Design a binder for this molecule. Structure first.
Ligand code: FE
Ligand code: FE
Lengths: 192, 192
């Protein structure tokens, strides 16, 4: 039995960039349904009692799709915050400049990958096995946890993440995403 | 060059089941963007001298995704009509009863397949090479035209198809889809 983790801020704290209505549906209905579907699928199985990351790394099918979406959305909500956004400093800024040349080049490449990601999915900044940073996109519930790369930051590009506020304009959603990035959470993941 | 086909009815003719606002974004912006993107991707290539269907059967990646979404949305708008829906008649009802037992059983099975189709995609009623009907789901821009089966009916379950009117309630959208089905189009597709 897994519980929907509390949001680390109020429902309206990302407004106007992501509306209170979008959190009401995206957290309150979509992320909640993935926890309920996961609890129903693993009841009575060898997956009950394993951690969420263990389930994601050992399953496939509906158990995988729901477990990875529960984890992926909790990671996403922790990637956003009120009174954040802007350019990183410190260790994060040094690693981003070393791998992409500059913060501006990273932002441009991450925005391009997130807009080109066809269909539903997620676009990720990851730390590779060799210590270098990379941008990778996944489809549907796919996550870097099934690989050797460590996830540092993500953006949800499933249409429910932005359709209430931006309709078809996924570029506008990505421009507002940058005003919300919680670089303290990215710093915690870089040093993990 | 390919052109966005005219919609078969006024943009408010499917209301209250699909609003005029969903038609202006889904037809006016999403279907139009796939035509524009296809045209720009094939400019100057050998794909420029082929029918849309031949492009769908011989391409991959971006050319395929846009060409198949152009075809899939034109097919979808023709499957819907004002003053239609209800139970089919004639050869269609006969064929549905032969392969599924009855219309109520077909309707249940198609609804279920459409609700369980994970992420973005399409659910189809097809006539297989052997003559039996079957329900098939595809992901993202996937279409039965790359196989031996003949498409007869489809429902778009990309979230942009229903999010303005139904938000997360894809079952509500499918209940209202049954009120719009153009059984005349389905019969012309079966008779070939
Ligand atoms: Fe989401
Ligand atoms: Fe669509």
């Amino acid at each position: 039995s897994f519980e929907l983790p509390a949001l680390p801020y109020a429902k309206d704290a990302l407004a106007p960039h992501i509306s209170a209505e979008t959190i009401e549906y995206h957290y309150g209905k979509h992320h909640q349904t993935y926890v309920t579907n996961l609890n129903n699928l693993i009841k009575g199985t060898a997956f009950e009692g394993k951690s969420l990351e263990e389930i994601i790394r050992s399953s496939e099918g509906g158990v995988f799709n729901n477990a990875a979406q529960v984890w992926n959305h909790t990671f996403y909500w922790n990637c956003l915050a009120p009174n954040a956004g802007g350019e990183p400093t410190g260790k994060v800024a040094e690693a981003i400049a070393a791998s992409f040349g500059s913060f501006a080049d990273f932002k441009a490449q991450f925005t391009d990958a997130a807009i080109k990601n066809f269909g539903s999915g997620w676009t990720w900044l990851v730390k590779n096995s060799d210590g270098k940073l990379a941008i990778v996109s996944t489809s549907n519930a796919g996550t870097p946890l099934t690989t050797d790369a460590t996830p540092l930051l993500t953006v949800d590009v499933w249409e429910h993440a932005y359709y209430i506020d931006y309709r078809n304009a996924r570029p506008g959603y990505l421009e507002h995403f940058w005003a919300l990035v919680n670089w303290e959470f990215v710093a915690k993941n870089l040093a993990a």
